[PDB]
């Protein structure tokens, strides 16, 4: 649709899937994650979108690794969404990948200053 993650708009399905299958075969202890700013977010940008993440990384650990790349100030709030839902704090990144990776074998996560996606 017209509301679609930007990475999927710029790379077609079969090309994405081929890279997802290859990187999962080459680095089976990590999971490929596409990280993008939510559309209506008022927040700093990330240098890159494509991350290889240890499966055993906690969600809270992942939050901090992205926060320090955005260079947020202490008073700046940060929220993450998988299919419009904030992940449970008890999840690992491998768990989110296993539950929610798309058919191209990427896991998509969005970040925002707001607590509701695209508010």
């Amino acid at each position: 649709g017209s509301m679609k993650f930007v990475y999927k708009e710029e790379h077609p399905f079969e090309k994405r899937r081929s890279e997802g299958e290859k990187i999962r075969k080459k680095y089976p202890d990590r999971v490929p994650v596409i990280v993008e700013k939510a559309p209506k977010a008022r927040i700093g940008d990330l240098d890159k979108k494509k991350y290889l993440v240890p499966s055993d990384l906690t969600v809270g650990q992942f939050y901090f690794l992205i926060r320090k790349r955005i260079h947020l100030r202490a008073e700046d709030a940060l929220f993450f969404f998988v299919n419009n839902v904030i992940p449970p704090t008890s999840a690992t990144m491998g768990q989110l990948y296993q539950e929610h990776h798309e058919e191209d074998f990427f896991l998509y996560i969005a970040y925002s200053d707001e607590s509701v996606y695209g508010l």
Binding site: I23, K26, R30, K48, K50, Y51, L52, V53, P54, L65
Partner: peptide, 12 residues
Amino acid sequence: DACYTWEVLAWP
């Protein structure tokens, strides 16, 4: 060589 477009994350 397959990772020129991928950044690897880690925790100490």
